[PDB]
Amino acid sequence: APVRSLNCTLRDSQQKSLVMSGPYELKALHLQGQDMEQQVVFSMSFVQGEESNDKIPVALGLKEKNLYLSCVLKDDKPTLQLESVDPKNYPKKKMEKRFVFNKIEINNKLEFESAQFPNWYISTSQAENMPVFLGGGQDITDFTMQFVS
Ligand SMILES: COCC(=O)Nc1ccc(O)cc1
Numbered sequence: 001a002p003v004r005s006l007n008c009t010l011r012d013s014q015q016k017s018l019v020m021s022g023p024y025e026l027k028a029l030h031l032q033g034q035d036m037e038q039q040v041v042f043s044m045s046f047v048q049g050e051e052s053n054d055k056i057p058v059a060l061g062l063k064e065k066n067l068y069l070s071c072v073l074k075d076d077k078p079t080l081q082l083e084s085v086d087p088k089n090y091p092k093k094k095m096e097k098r099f100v101f102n103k104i105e106i107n108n109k110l111e112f113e114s115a116q117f118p119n120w121y122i123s124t125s126q127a128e129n130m131p132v133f134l135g136g137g138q139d140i141t142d143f144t145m146q147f148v149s
Pocket residue numbers: 105108109110143144145146
């Protein structure tokens with residue numbers, strides 16, 4: 001059938017919200033009140049890949065944008081980018097591996113591991129207004145997920 005998707009937001013375990021940082025980056029900052037409209041709404045797609053009770057393969061697209069989080073090599077290490085795709089072809093059930101995250105439930109939170117790069121996770125900094133990155137400590141790898149209409 002058609003790939004299944006849900007709209008959602010993510011916050012890090014320090015309750016920082018994610019926002020756009022120019023066209024191909026996200027940043028995390030403390031947001032409350034009217035400013036919470038700046039937060040990115042994801043379309044989380046449930047994709048093909050290796051699955052267990054608490055390991056669920058997803059893609060993270062920006063709602064109604066042909067942009068996906070992807071894990072791509074740079075300076076010889078796994079890194080997080082926003083990548084444009086053909087809007088005719090996405091989302092799809094068989095997403096390419098660079099777009100796949102294992103959504104893992106650990107102690108009432110979520111971690112998003114790169115399917116491509118084992119043990120590299122979507123991360124934030126403790127400081128305000130710094131990029132979201134891929135991290136292999138002080139950095140934050142746990143999130144909560146709010147399901148949106
Ligand atoms: C199949 O997913 C089960 C579940 O409880 N997921 C979950 C959702 C939001 C959150 O903040 C923590 C965990």
